[PDB]
Amino acid sequence: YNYLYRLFRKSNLKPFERDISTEIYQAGSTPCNGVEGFNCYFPLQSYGFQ
Amino acid sequence: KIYSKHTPINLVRDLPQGFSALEPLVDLPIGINITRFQTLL
Ligand SMILES: *[C@@H]1O[C@H](CO)[C@@H](O)[C@H](O)[C@H]1NC(C)=O
């Protein structure tokens, strides 16, 4: 699980754009206020290579 | 990227109406994003 990819963003990366920022992704009308919930999710996922 | 020029002047109030082209000093592969800046003195 040391290897991860971003699953959510407001808009696509431009050519060679890099974006570490760890903000919890608000998908819906309800804000995250720093934690997951109703239509709100952590920005990354992992391949979990087996 | 960065460019510059220097010149002597006589008028003190604001920029002297004339022409003199700026030449490059630096290019960097920064990747970082700029939206704001400030002067240091
Ligand atoms: C710079 O960063 C902001 C987020 O802080 C982003 O919204 C904006 O689109 C970026 N600007 C450029 C020119 O990529």
UniProtKB/Swiss-Prot annotation, chain B:
Effect of D14G: In strain: Beta/B.1.351
Domain of life: Viruses
Phenotype for V12G: In strain: Omicron/BA.2, Omicron/BA.2.12.1, Omicron/BA.2.75, Omicron/BA.4, Omicron/BA.5, Omicron/BQ.1.1
Glycan attachment sites: N33
Result for mutant: V12E: In strain: Omicron/XBB.1.5, Omicron/EG.5.1
Purpose of the protein: Attaches the virion to the cell membrane by interacting with host receptor, initiating the infection. The major receptor is host ACE2. When S2/S2' has been cleaved, binding to the receptor triggers direct fusion at the cell membrane. When S2/S2' has not been cleaved, binding to the receptor results in internalization of the virus by endocytosis using host TFRC and GRM2 and leading to fusion of the virion membrane with the host endosomal membrane. Alternatively, may use NRP1/NRP2 and integrin as entry receptors.
Assembly: Binds to host ACE2. RBD also interacts with the N-linked glycan on 'Asn-90' of ACE2. Cleavage of S generates a polybasic C-terminal sequence on S1 that binds to host Neuropilin-1 (NRP1) and Neuropilin-2 (NRP2) receptors. Interacts with host integrin alpha-5/beta-1 (ITGA5:ITGB1) and with ACE2 in complex with integrin alpha-5/beta-1 (ITGA5:ITGB1). May interact via cytoplasmic c-terminus with M protein. May interact (via N-terminus) with host bilirubin and biliverdin, thereby preventing antibody binding to the SARS-CoV-2 spike NTD via an allosteric mechanism.
Name of the molecule in the record: Spike protein S1
Organism of derivation: Severe acute respiratory syndrome coronavirus 2 (2019-nCoV)
Lineage: Viruses, Riboviria, Orthornavirae, Pisuviricota, Pisoniviricetes
